[PDB]
């Protein structure tokens, strides 16, 4: 009975509504990062933990986009028990202590989501809320992460109720992304206007240009340098330890094996 | 320009086929997107992405992990080079005398040196039928020269 | 015991670095779809392409009959359709 | 690009309220904006 009452009051209740998915995902990103960094049976363990962080993040996205408090309850319960049971499978550590710690933060923010509820407006990219410079840089960085952009799109499509196909979902995502980047730039130009016909600031030019040139230098010259440096190192003294002179004389029985060694 | 008209035609055909199939089998206005269709395509894409990052790592580790082929000294050649001028004392043995230590034998050695952690470690870490017995022959007959 | 090298290059960094490089380049390959899908919605979202396939098939018909003067003329239509996006909208209208 | 982000955000709003009929309709606007470059010029005018 009591357990049923607890669960009823964790589902039906009368609480508020917060969106702490951003922070939950950030906790899981930190977790992923430290497990990736913590490659140090061990490779197999770290590879299983990789697949795990990933799978759990995907399930979390599902429950967030489907606004399931009951689903989040179930996931939390399972995950708590499973991660705590993985402490018993230590057989393949500061890295693991930190992984536990950051996963504890994820469990705390997840527990908050369940006990608060899911807010009506869940859609909308976190880094496209304001149109400043920080939002711009963060968004572009998210787009630079190998597969985050595409994963987000496909995943969201699968959960969110749409009439459009993946092709068309990706179209509206691309349009929005580009439009946001343009908006941020437009906003910053309104905030900090540049006089009409004001060169381009010698220093700015020198910086960007210099970096590009140096990057190009490191495409051609640097590899050559590294290559030559490593290959050049050659030469380890090799001296005959012994002087074995066998003066094989007799055709039938070769002898005369008087010879010497290192002392001589 | 030949390639231009070929590209245009190819694209136009693909569009036409899609238009025709939508006329043949129309999709109601505002009818979700069918949960199953989504789950299928999305799932495949995710799995393909999994196989870009995780699968190579798995394969790599699997192959590389396999390591360890027993290597035991076939013979125990103890040449006690004594005489500076003429080094001799070559009484030594071979495989018949050499005894690949069994599991029980290994336990014995490990327990003998159990007090010293690293001593036992050496023995225990080396796999059974690894530690070989140096039963070097001591008898002579070979006079010296 | 002996240890057979089942790596080839270097498990620690050689193969590792190669793996990273592959992932990145596959990254760009996959981006190649979901980045500029919106720069073609003018050549790929045409409502009715029937009038354009007629043009294309007329070029083919005029090459079989070897009246290559009209090949040049019908090619001119094709390139102007694809040089002015507004005329594509007109020509690809669903009904008329 | 203010008028285009409004369109994009309206598609998002209409998917949260699950009125997916209007999703199809607002998607039609998006694709025509990007199918005719001249209408983009009109819609993206600085002032009006």
């Amino acid at each position: 009975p009591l357990r049923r009452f607890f669960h009823d009051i964790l589902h039906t209740k009368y609480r508020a509504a917060t969106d702490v998915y951003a922070l939950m995902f950030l906790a899981d990103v930190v977790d992923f990062i430290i497990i990736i960094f913590g490659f140090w049976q061990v490779p197999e363990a770290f590879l299983v933990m990789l697949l795990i962080q990933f799978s759990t993040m995907v399930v979390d996205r599902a429950l967030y986009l489907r606004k399931t408090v009951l689903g989040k309850l179930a996931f939390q319960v399972a995950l708590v028990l499973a991660i705590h049971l993985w402490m018993f499978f230590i057989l393949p550590n500061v890295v693991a202590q930190l992984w536990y710690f950051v996963k504890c933060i994820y469990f705390a923010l997840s527990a908050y989501q369940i006990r608060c509820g899911y807010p009506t407006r869940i859609l909308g990219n976190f880094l496209t809320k304001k149109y400043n410079h920080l939002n711009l840089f963060l968004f572009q960085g998210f787009r630079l992460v190998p597969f985050l952009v595409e994963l987000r799109a496909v995943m969201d499509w699968v959960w969110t109720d749409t009439t459009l196909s993946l092709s068309s979902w990706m179209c509206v995502e691309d349009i929005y992304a580009n439009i946001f980047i343009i908006k941020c730039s437009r906003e910053t130009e309104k905030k900090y206007p540049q006089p009409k016909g004001q060169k381009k600031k010698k220093i700015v030019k020198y910086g960007m240009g210099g970096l590009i040139i140096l990057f190009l230098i490191a495409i051609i010259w640097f590899p050559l340098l590294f290559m030559s440096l490593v290959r050049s190192v050659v030469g380890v003294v090799n001296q005959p330890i012994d002087v074995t002179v066998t003066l094989k004389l007799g055709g039938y029985e070769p002898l005369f094996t008087m010879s010497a060694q290192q002392p001589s | 320009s030949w390639m231009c008209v070929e590209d245009i035609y190819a694209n136009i055909f693909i569009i036409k086929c899609s238009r025709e199939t939508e006329k043949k089998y129309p999709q109601p206005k505002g009818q979700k997107k069918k949960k199953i269709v989504k789950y299928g395509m999305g799932g495949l894409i995710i799995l393909f992405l999994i196989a870009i990052i995780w699968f190579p790592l798995l394969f790599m580790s699997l192959v590389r992990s396999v390591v360890g082929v027993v290597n035991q000294p076939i013979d125990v050649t103890v040449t006690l080079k004594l005489g500076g001028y003429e080094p001799l004392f070559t009484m030594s043995a071979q495989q018949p005398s050499i005894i690949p230590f069994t599991a029980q034998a290994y336990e014995e050695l490990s327990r003998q040196f159990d007090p010293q952690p690293l001593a036992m470690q050496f023995i225990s870490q080396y796999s059974p039928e690894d530690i070989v017995t140096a039963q070097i022959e001591g008898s002579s007959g070979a006079l010296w020269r | 015991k002996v240890s057979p090298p089942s790596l080839g290059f270097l498990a620690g960094y050689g193969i590792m670095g190669l793996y990273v490089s592959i992932v990145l380049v596959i990254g760009k390959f996959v981006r190649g779809f979901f980045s500029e899908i919106s720069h073609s919605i003018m050549f790929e979202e045409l409502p009715c392409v029937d009038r354009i396939l007629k043009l294309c098939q007329d070029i083919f018909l005029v090459r079989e009959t070897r009246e290559l003067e009209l090949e040049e003329e019908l090619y001119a239509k094709l390139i102007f359709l694809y040089r002015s996006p507004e005329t594509m909208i007109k020509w690809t209208r669903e009904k008329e | 690009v203010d008028r285009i982000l409004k369109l994009c955000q309206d598609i998002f709003l209409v998917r949260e309220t699950r009125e997916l009929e209007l999703e199809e309709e607002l998607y039609a606007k998006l694709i025509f904006l990007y199918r005719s470059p001249e209408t983009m010029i009109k819609w993206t005018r600085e002032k009006e």
């Binding site: 009439t163 | 009818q31 | 669903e94 | 606007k29």
Partner: peptide, 20 residues
Amino acid sequence: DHATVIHSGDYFLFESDSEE
């Protein structure tokens, strides 16, 4: 149908009819 309704866009939608 979905197809016809996503391919129905015309210039009249983008006229400036009190777009606030």
